[PDB]
Amino acid sequence: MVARPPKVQVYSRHPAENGKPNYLNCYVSGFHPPQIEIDLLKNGEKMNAEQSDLSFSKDWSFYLLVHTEFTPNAVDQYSCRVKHVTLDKPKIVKWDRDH
């Protein structure tokens, strides 16, 4: 069968408030085969973030959660970068407070 591309969402655990500690999540789902690179970035540089144990949904597609602590402010930008056989260049999704 044909490979299945990843869906990507980037979002905070709690509503963001500048100066308050929080957690930053990149949830990646719907993909096959399971080889994948998922990086959370701060101003375009890789963060050292924890990755969940590989699992899958009832349609056999894989999902992973990458997460770390952060303190949002008025300056720093965050994003998630994903590499997979279905993607001809890296998929980059920007974090904003409204999604």
Binding site: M1, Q9, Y27, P33, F56, W60, L65
Partner: protein
């Protein structure tokens, strides 16, 4: 509520360049992961992933470790066998996935059991609802089906799913009662966002809820708006709760003609909300 369940999800990947494979297994009660195993880990063991399973003693951890180690070995052989059935090259990596488990009925008996396989993402072989026969997807899977018929594999599965699986599930529900048997309702609100047209985006949020099952819909004058709505996949917060949202574009000035509707087992009845600045 809905029925509780115990499930295990395992992934085996061949690695021809290394002469080996990697096996990863995870166990869940409902939406809550509670164990893992990874054959690449040094000194590999079945390991706790929820606080309430750490009360099990050494015999439990040794027994579960021995049994999942044995499955990792058998699934390494199965990768080689399936490459042969499909006459595939020895140089490529392939994936064999396995899911099995039990749902609990309101009387304490098995509601539904399952045991199924996929190769490279496609259904391969599955135990039928009767727990007494198998369904194969192609001519390769028929070979495996005949071996399992000859070995009476279904009798073994029937015994495990009606007995050990249900019994274990009931013990775990008691050990984790304060978290597993408690529902938390969603916190809800509607936001408004300027949008690229002269249309405005409304976004209905549900936050902090458990279990993961939820409905979010939009109406205008009793009329469902699903055909023009963006609904994101339900996503983990990271602390055992979930999030979801539903958004649509509406004409400017007309925002309060639209209502968001939320249903969740934590709610005493369904919620209606609107843009409420």
């Amino acid at each position: 509520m809905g029925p509780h369940s115990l499930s295990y999800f395992s992934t085996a990947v061949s690695r021809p360049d290394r002469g080996d494979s990697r096996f990863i297994a995870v166990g869940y009660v409902d939406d809550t992961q509670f164990v893992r195993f990874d054959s690449d880990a040094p000194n590999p063991r079945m390991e706790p992933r929820a606080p309430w399973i750490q009360q099990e003693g050494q015999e439990y951890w040794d027994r579960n470790t021995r049994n999942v180690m044995g499955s990792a070995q058998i699934n390494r052989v199965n990768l080689k066998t399936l490459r042969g059935y499909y006459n595939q090259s020895e140089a490529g990596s392939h994936t064999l996935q396995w899911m099995y488990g039990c749902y609990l009925g309101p009387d304490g008996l098995l509601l539904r059991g399952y045991d199924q396989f996929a190769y490279d993402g496609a259904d391969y072989l599955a135990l039928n609802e009767d727990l007494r026969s198998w369904t194969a997807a192609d001519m390769a899977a028929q070979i495996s089906k005949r071996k399992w018929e000859a070995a009476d594999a279904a009798e073994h599965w029937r015994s495990y799913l009606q007995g050990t699986c249900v019994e274990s599930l009931r013990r775990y529900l008691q050990m984790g009662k304060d978290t597993l048997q408690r529902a938390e309702p969603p916190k809800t609100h509607v936001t408004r966002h300027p949008s690229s047209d002269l249309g405005v985006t409304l976004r209905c949020w549900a936050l902090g809820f458990h279990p993961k099952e939820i409905s979010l819909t939009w109406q205008r004058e009793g009329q469902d708006q699903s055909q023009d709505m963006e609904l994101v996949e339900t996503r983990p917060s990271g602390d055992g709760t979930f999030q979801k949202w539903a958004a649509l574009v509406v004409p400017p000035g007309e925002e309060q003609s639209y209502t968001c509707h939320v249903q969740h087992e934590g709610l005493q009845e369904p919620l209606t909300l609107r843009w409420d600045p």
